[PDB]
């Protein structure tokens, strides 16, 4: 695999070591596209959201912007008129739970959208958002070099959306904007109530019991259920500009490309 002989950053525990977990990993050394999907892609992945809702703001989740190349998958753009886009995503067919350490290799797009490697359960209440980039300094360069590392809780009805916002939340590299190269992304989820996340294999952030869930959706359960993994991108017009219909058009810049993702879990 691509990533052979790079160390997990997250500790195992003491007499412990990672375990990889075949089902939700892919170094993505295929070729593949809609009317070319092989068993190297769909036993792991579908092309597609949860279930079916289309996504947020100006969002068309699309199942043809979900392809590989032979090396990385492309999770794209592109123009749909009417101020919206069409959007790549990929879902896994698997489900992970804590505890799980979780790592793409991945260059953000130089567009306004979101570009996101997150989970989500099934019955939307609880999320992970390993990392979530707005690559395009015309977002603002405040955004452009910032990577956004948090999670939710949420309840559906009424909507109810809880995130931590403390300025930890926003991970600043010294103003080298995340869309000039590829990073590792990574997270360990390691119980309900703590994460830790890993960019270029380094520590950034470690989020405890407080923060997880103080308004009290998950009615103290914390993030302990058994989840989806998503890569996706997205027009979120409800907080954002909306990307212009040449931008989505730009194939040199309308690609979130993933290297590969890696998940394992600790083992004695
Ligand atoms: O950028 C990546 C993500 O980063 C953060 O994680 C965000 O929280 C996430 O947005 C969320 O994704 C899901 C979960 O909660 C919201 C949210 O935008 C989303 O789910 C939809 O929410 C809307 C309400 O705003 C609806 O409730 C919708 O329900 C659907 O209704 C019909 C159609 O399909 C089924 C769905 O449940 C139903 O039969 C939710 O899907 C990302 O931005
Ligand atoms: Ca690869």
């Known amino acids: 695999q691509d990533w052979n002989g790079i160390p997990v950053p997250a500790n195992p525990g003491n007499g412990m070591t990672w375990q990889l977990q075949d089902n939700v990993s892919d170094s993505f050394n295929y070729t593949s596209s809609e009317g070319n999907r092989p068993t190297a892609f769909t036993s792991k992945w579908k092309p597609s959201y949860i279930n079916g809702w ?58 306004v959208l979101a ?43 009424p909507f109810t959306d809880y995130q931590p916002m403390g300025d930890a939340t926003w991970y600043y590299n010294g103003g080298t904007p995340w869309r000039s ?10 119980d309900p109530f703590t994460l830790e996340y890993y960019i270029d294999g380094v520590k950034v952030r470690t989020v405890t019991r407080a923060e997880i869930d103080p308004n009290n959706h998950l009615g103290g359960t914390g993030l302990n259920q058994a989840t989806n993994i998503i890569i996706d991108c997205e027009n979120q017009t409800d907080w954002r500009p909306a990307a212009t219909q040449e931008e989505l058009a730009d194939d040199s810049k309308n690609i979130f490309w993933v290297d590969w993702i890696r998940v394992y879990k600790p083992v004695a």
Not at 85 to 91: D, E, F, L, Q, R
């Open 54 to 111: 289309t996504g947020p703001g100006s969002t068309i989740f699309n199942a043809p912007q979900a392809w590989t190349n032979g090396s990385q998958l492309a999770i794209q753009a592109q123009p749909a008129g009417n101020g919206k886009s069409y959007n790549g995503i990929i879902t896994s067919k698997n489900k992970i739970q804590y505890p799980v350490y979780m790592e793409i290799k991945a260059k953000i797009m130089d567009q």
């Open 181 to 190: 190269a590829y990073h590792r992304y990574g997270c360990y989820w390691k």
């Open 115 to 157: 570009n996101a490697f997150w989970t989500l359960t099934d019955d939307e209440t609880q999320s992970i958002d390993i990392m979530e980039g707005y690559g395009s300094d015309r977002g603002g360069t405040w955004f452009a070099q910032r990577m956004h590392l948090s999670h939710h809780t949420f309840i559906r009805n």
